[PDB]
Design a protein around this ligand. Structure first.
Ligand SMILES: [Mg+2]
Lengths: 201, 206, 547, 49, 51, 49, 221, 98, 12
């Protein structure tokens, strides 16, 4: 499906829609439904998820938990173009992908599409968590340079934050810690860039 | 010589009527007989459509007809045209403007009338009532009914005497006024006289 | 409409074939959502073939890309039209212009990461107004082939279907024109996949009363899959000749017979009405009968007192035209009954083809692709509530929050000039709405519209409202109150100083940037941000077609 | 009829119109394609053309 | 029509000392920000004291 | 003077260069070529002829 | 000892929108109560919009009726924009009958004993022949927020429009200095709302304060 | 003064049906002289349940026809004009007594 | 919460 941002996520997890999640995890949901005792034969379970009753979404949040998936950009050139995430379910129809990870996939958001793959067996879940997890790929294998470098909005937010101007609100006042620095920025008594002696530890 | 009507005695606490209006003593017969022909002709017009109950609500100088079916499309007939053909003639029968309305039941294996006319269509056919009435029983037991009793009577099977047979599966508390019961009758005319069918379907509480 | 166009919209709209351009000008007689009747002016009109034109518009039908090629009438009744002029707008047109997408209130600011690379963040005010809600139409075909053990069945006589399964078909299998269907119901019932089903003594007893040998051999009704909703708007049934028409195919045959009968009879009635209006127009002079004209039946308006002139010659020519219309109507109704009644040549071994048109209405959701007209793409990433939007010190929330960082690298600086000039256009539109909502007389409206139409260097337009006569100015302001359209040709466009002078005519700030408050915190964004109107397009790379 | 029906039916230049916009009609009809019979493909063309 | 999802403090995970972390649920699709902003602005200044 | 649908909503127009040749009929390649093809004209000039 | 806000002046400057006024307020509470009441008023207020329409000779909403120059879809949009007040009911069914050349305004609805149209000049459609008449039934109900058609019809003749149960349009507060009280460093909160006529402004500010004080009941005494 | 006499069968419906005209008259006239009880006729019937002999087996049937009064006091146009249209009560036969 | 609730007892 088509990707989109979702900046609330951590680099280890990605958003994955509920409709795709109920289609990719049909046998795990069948096994979970047969374990509880809600149904009997396999047919009954396929009718239950064909109807999508109120009880299969709790079953789905049980199988998604601690089960990584392989996200994959379609022109995969190096090994950082297949990375394993943990799903977080999405009301929607678009894969929410953590932004820093985009600089690894060469993925902008101008109409891009990605494929999800499910590690079925247990050794494959452990390979997705222990080798291919997105927290494990923070350095590019071609060199020593970090590949989870902050790309474009966040460096503008930092460059506007840590800068200075020759006069602002609270020029040259003295502050007993960084906590009241943020308290002076939020209350409206100083500016985000106003030079100040602080006491840092 | 016993067992007064289930749909008879629940009509103040559980199930409503099938004609809800008030007319005074001068026009009570005029209102009632007009209801009788709009039930006669419509069931005659919609015999195969599997219609269970018909509700007739007259707010005076008007009549709201309601049709409860398991086949919605055949009742509408021709995208309204069939209903407009009825609209010209239902208003012609009762002599009053008719606002035809349609309802629907999702489970015909739980509605008493729909179970009963099924066996009527079966037994007019030369099928084995023994596994035709067993068919209707195992249908409702897995479709959500808490209990169902099905009775057939007549000279079934071509026999000389009138062998009668009844069969139930599940709770059917006829005496309990708190117990809702869906009951209806249907009769089948083969060449071996008339074979009447009666079926009770129990559901629950108030 | 585009608030910031190039004036090239009318060439692309009229010189294509989606609008209903008038052939001969005149006076409109009957507007309807189906048809439009023009009465042709007398200084444009043939002597014979009396002539009032009928435009049969093309209502909801399938395009090639599953869009909805509609035509809407845009003229009033009694309205004059000129030769070479739009009567019915088409798809993505408006009053003869070319309106592809819609124009919305945009702000360039980073907003909490939800527009990170190229993404777009849209208020719920956009989806509540039903303004990107596009209408798609899918065609679903079902053929009745010819195989072994016999032909197929389209009838609804089917087992297994537990009544609720279909709850949509009539007595003859085909679905309803007007039935809202879900994903996975039955549209056309077709008992066909027949392998083998076990038969018991009771199933064998079907041979006695019903008559069927075994009910074919197996039992299963061709049911359809899921993924799409819709509303069945149009059903076609084609029958290879020789095959028995069922009751619904005869219903469609009676329906189209009735439609074509009514349509050709209205052709004869409308052209006969124009012909009798010509007879009344001729008999104004030369043996006029003011009272004696409507005492006799109307089909004999020829034997009245009038000598051998051009007028009796013209009444003879109109009698020739009238008898031609009579015999032509006879032979054409016979040929049209032949075209409806006949079969159609079809595939080798097919009985009948049923085509059903579902009409989905796809709104907008996180994952669709929107884009402006300069290359600023983007997957819309979060459909915010109304309250969270950055508003200004008037009260109005902005609709869409783009990302500023796409401008210095991807060098499309034209979108910011388009944004400022769109805000100027809407400032003029807001001042017209303020001067009209207060019920002001036409003098002040004339003053302000004239000042907004002069406003520039040596330009080409040079309009004056002193020849619009106090009723068109109110209707022109009725059309300008949602904004004033501005043409900007390609390489000879509006310079910066003209945009500044037009932003000075409205009471907007000169630099184009309003200070904007926040919706969450309720406290002001520092360093005032750029708002305006950008004309943004929805592209048909949707997300519930890729997922 | 076979020759003219094969040309209008399936050629490399008798192509399916994208009906979804008045602009897309009026700019698909005005197209100067270099491909087709008596031309090249995406593999043959270099940088000059 | 005046019936909303009345919330509650499901837990007070007071991390260590002189520091708490109070989570509240469930609120409407928009009331988390208005209660966070109201309580944030009032605690910052309105709340009195001595120093 | 303006046409009656141009008195509905007259578009404001910037622009400086006074035009001298209006935009031609944009579908003239297709229509003019196929009119050149099928048209009763012998001397071996029309497409089929 | 905080000064408490009391409503002082309700300037009904036009028929749609008004300017309520709070006085007095300690410094800081102006923006707090302003943003809070703005966000409650835009979020969830009880409106009275429309849900179902049944035009008589119309099967599906994509058809066309003989004798009206707009489609049935455009009639549904024009009825979606209908501004109507109800008084003592949950839902209500309005009836429309109109015959003759000309517009079908919103004042042609046969009004019940409690339904009140607030803008009777609202056009729905245009009838355009001498014997061509529409006759529809409209269903208007209470609600809160935006309830579309895809979330929530049994015959084929009903038509479901979307439901924008929201009476207000634009809420703008402007804090300003106070001088009525001799004490300085006090503020005035002036809220210009923008209603569509279905909600009284003091009733709107009262319901917003009730909703917010209900939300703070989770951790107040 | 202006009486409104109600007539129905479903007594569990008439208390809400009178309440539907209470709310229609409360917002208009603001003075309504109560939902008076008005005693109900009990039309008693008996029927030979058999299609033949044994005149011992019978079934008894009755119809409680319930009545109410609303009695709008003032002749204000508000009440009549509003209530001229809204009287609701389907299956509930309504009548004025004035 | 007590301060904010005491600042709304003149409305509800
Ligand atoms: Mg890309």
């Amino acid at each position: 499906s088509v990707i989109t941002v979702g900046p609330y996520l951590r680099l280890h997890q990605c958003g994955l829609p509920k409709k795709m999640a109920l289609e990719l995890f049909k046998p795990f949901i069948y096994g979970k439904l047969e374990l509880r005792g809600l149904a009997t034969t396999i047919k009954a379970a396929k009718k239950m998820v064909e109807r999508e009753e109120a009880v299969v979404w709790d079953i789905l949040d049980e199988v998604i938990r601690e089960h990584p998936v392989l996200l994959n950009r379609a022109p995969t050139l190096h090994r950082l173009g297949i990375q394993a995430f943990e799903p977080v379910l999405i009301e929607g129809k678009a894969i929410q992908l953590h932004p820093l990870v985009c600089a690894a996939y060469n993925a902008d958001f101008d109409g891009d599409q990605m494929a999800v793959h499910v590690p079925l067996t247990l050794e494959a879940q452990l390979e997705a968590r222990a080798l291919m997890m997105s927290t494990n790929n923070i350095l590019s294998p071609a060199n020593g340079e970090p590949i989870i470098v902050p790309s474009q909005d966040v460096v503008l937010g930092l460059y506007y934050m840590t800068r200075d101007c020759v006069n602002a609100k609270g020029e040259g006042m003295v502050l007993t810690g960084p906590k009241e620095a943020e308290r002076l920025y939020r209350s409206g008594l100083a500016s985000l860039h106003a030079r100040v002696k602080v006491r840092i530890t | 010589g016993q067992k007064v009507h289930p749909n008879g005695i629940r009509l103040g606490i559980v199930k409503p009527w099938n004609s809800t209006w008030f007319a005074n003593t001068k026009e009570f017969a005029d209102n009632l007989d007009s209801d009788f022909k709009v039930r006669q002709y419509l069931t005659k017009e919609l015999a195969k459509a599997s219609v269970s109950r018909i509700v007739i609500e007259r707010p005076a100088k008007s009549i709201r007809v309601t049709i409860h079916t398991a086949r919605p499309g055949i009742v509408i007939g021709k995208k309204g045209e069939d209903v407009e053909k009825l609209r010209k003639v239902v208003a012609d029968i009762a002599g009053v403007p008719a606002q035809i309305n349609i309802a629907e039941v999702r489970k015909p294996e739980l509605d008493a009338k729909l179970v009963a006319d099924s066996i009527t269509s079966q037994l007019e056919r030369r099928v084995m009532f023994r596994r035709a009435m067993k068919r209707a029983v195992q249908n409702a037991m897995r479709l959500g009914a808490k209990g169902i009793k099905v009775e057939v009577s007549g000279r079934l099977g071509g026999a000389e005497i009138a062998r009668t047979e009844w069969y139930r599966e599940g709770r059917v508390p006829l005496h309990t006024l708190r117990a809702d019961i869906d009951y209806n009758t249907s009769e089948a005319h083969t060449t071996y006289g008339v074979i009447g069918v009666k079926v009770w379907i129990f559901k629950g509480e108030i | 409409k585009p608030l910031v166009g190039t004036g090239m919209e009318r060439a692309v709209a009229v010189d294509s074939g989606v609008t209903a351009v008038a052939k001969r000008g005149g006076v409109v007689q009957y507007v309807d959502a189906s048809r439009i009747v023009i009465k042709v002016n007398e200084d444009e009109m043939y002597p014979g073939e009396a002539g009032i034109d009928i435009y049969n518009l093309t209502k909801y039908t399938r395009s090639n890309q599953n869009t909805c090629i509609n035509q809407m009438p845009c003229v009033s009744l009694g309205e004059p039209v000129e030769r070479g002029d739009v009567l019915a707008d088409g798809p993505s047109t408006d009053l003869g212009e070319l309106a592809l997408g819609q124009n919305m209130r945009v702000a360039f600011m980073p907003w909490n990461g939800y527009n990170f690379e190229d993404s777009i963040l849209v208020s719920e005010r956009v989806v509540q107004e039903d303004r990107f809600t596009t209408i798609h139409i899918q065609e679903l075909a079902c053929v009745s082939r010819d195989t072994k053990l016999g032909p197929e069945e389209i009838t609804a006589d089917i087992p297994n279907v537990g009544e609720a399964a279909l709850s949509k078909l009539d007595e003859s299998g085909i679905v309803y024109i007007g039935a809202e269907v879900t994903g996975g119901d039955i549209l056309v019932g077709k008992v066909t996949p027949k392998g083998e089903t076990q038969l018991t003594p009771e199933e064998k007893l079907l041979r006695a009363i019903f008559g069927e040998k075994a009910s074919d051999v197996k039992d299963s009704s061709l049911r359809v899959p899921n993924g799409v909703s819709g509303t069945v708007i149009d059903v076609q049934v084609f029958t290879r000749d020789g095959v028995e028409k069922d009751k619904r195919a005869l219903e469609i045959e009676e329906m189209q017979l009735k439609q074509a009968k009514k349509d050709l009879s209205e052709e004869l009635q409308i052209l006969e009405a124009g012909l009798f209006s010509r007879i009344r127009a001729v008999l104004v002079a030369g043996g006029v009968e003011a009272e004696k004209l409507d005492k006799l039946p109307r089909d004999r308006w020829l034997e009245l007192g009038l000598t051998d002139e051009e007028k009796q010659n013209q009444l003879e020519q109109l009698a020739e035209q009238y008898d031609e219309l009579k015999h032509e109507f006879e032979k054409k109704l016979e040929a049209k009954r032949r075209k409806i009644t006949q079969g159609d040549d079809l595939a080798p071994g097919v009985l009948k083809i049923v085509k059903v048109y579902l009409a989905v209405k796809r709104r907008i959701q996180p994952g669709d692709k929107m884009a402006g007209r300069h290359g600023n793409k983007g997957v819309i990433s979060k459909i915010n509530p109304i309250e969270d939007m950055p508003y200004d010190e008037n009260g109005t929330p902005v609709d869409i929050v783009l990302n500023p960082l796409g401008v210095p690298s991807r060098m499309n600086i034209g979108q910011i000039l388009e944004t400022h000039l769109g805000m100027a256009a809407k400032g003029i539109g807001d001042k017209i709405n303020a001067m009209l909502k207060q019920q002001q007389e036409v003098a002040k409206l004339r003053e302000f519209i004239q000042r907004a139409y002069d406003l520039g260097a040596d330009v080409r337009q040079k309009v004056d409202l002193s020849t619009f006569s106090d009723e068109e100015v109110m209707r022109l302001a009725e059309n300008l109150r949602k904004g004033m359209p501005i043409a900007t040709p390609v390489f000879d466009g509006a310079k910066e100083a003209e945009i500044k002078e037009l932003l000075k005519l409205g009471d907007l700030p000169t630099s184009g940037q309003i200070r904007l408050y926040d919706g969450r915190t309720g406290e002001q964004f520092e360093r005032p941000v750029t708002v305006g109107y950008m004309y943004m397009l929805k592209l048909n790379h949707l997300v519930d077609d890729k997922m | 009829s076979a020759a003219v029906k094969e040309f209008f039916g399936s050629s490399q230049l008798s192509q399916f119109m994208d009906q979804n916009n008045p602009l897309s009609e009026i700019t698909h009809k005005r197209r100067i394609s270099a491909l087709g019979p008596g031309g090249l493909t995406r593999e043959r063309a270099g940088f000059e053309v | 029509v005046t019936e909303f999802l009345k919330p509650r403090l499901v837990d007070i995970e007071q991390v260590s000392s002189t520091h708490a972390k109070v989570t509240l649920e469930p609120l409407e699709r928009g009331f988390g920000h208005t209660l966070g902003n109201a309580l944030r602005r009032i605690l910052l200044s309105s709340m009195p004291g001595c120093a | 003077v303006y046409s009656y649908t141009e008195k509905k909503r007259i578009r404001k127009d910037f622009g400086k260069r006074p035009q001298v040749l209006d935009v031609p009929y944009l579908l003239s390649i297709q229509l003019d070529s196929f009119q050149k093809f099928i048209e009763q004209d012998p001397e071996g000039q029309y497409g089929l002829e | 000892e905080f000064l408490k806000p009391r409503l002082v002046d309700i300037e009904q400057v036009s028929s749609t929108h008004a300017k309520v006024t709070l006085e007095p307020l300690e410094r800081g509470f102006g923006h707090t109560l302003g943003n809070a009441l703005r966000r409650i008023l835009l979020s969830s207020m009880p409106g009275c919009a429309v849900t179902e329409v049944e035009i008589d000779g119309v099967l599906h909403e994509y058809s066309t009726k003989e004798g009206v120059q707009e489609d049935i879809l455009e009639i549904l949009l024009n009825l979606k924009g209908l501004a109507v007040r109800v008084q003592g009911k949950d839902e209500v069914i309005l009836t429309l009958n109109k015959s003759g050349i000309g517009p079908v305004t919103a004042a042609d609805i046969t009004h019940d004993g409690d339904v009140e149209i607030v803008k009777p000049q609202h056009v729905i459609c245009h009838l355009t022949d001498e014997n061509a008449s529409i006759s529809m039934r409209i269903k208007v109900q209470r609600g809160r927020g935006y309830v579309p058609a895809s979330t929530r019809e049994r015959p084929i003749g009903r038509l479901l429009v979307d439901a924008c149960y929201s009476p207000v349009e634009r809420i703008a507060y402007n804090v300003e200095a106070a001088r009525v009280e001799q004490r300085t460093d006090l503020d005035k909160l002036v809220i210009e709302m923008e209603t569509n006529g279905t909600i009284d402004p003091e009733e709107a500010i009262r319901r917003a304060a009730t909703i917010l004080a209900e939300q703070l009941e989770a951790f107040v005494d | 003064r202006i009486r409104i006499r109600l007539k129905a069968f479903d007594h569990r419906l008439i208390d809400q049906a009178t309440a539907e005209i209470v709310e229609t008259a409360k917002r208009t006239g603001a003075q309504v002289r109560g939902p008076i009880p008005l005693p109900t006729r009990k039309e008693r019937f008996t029927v030979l349940i058999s299609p033949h002999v044994n005149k011992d087996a019978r079934d008894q049937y009755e119809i409680r026809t319930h009545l109410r009064l609303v009695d709008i006091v003032e002749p204000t146009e508000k009440t009549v004009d509003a209530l001229m249209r809204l009287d609701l009560a389907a299956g509930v036969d309504v009548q004025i007594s004035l």
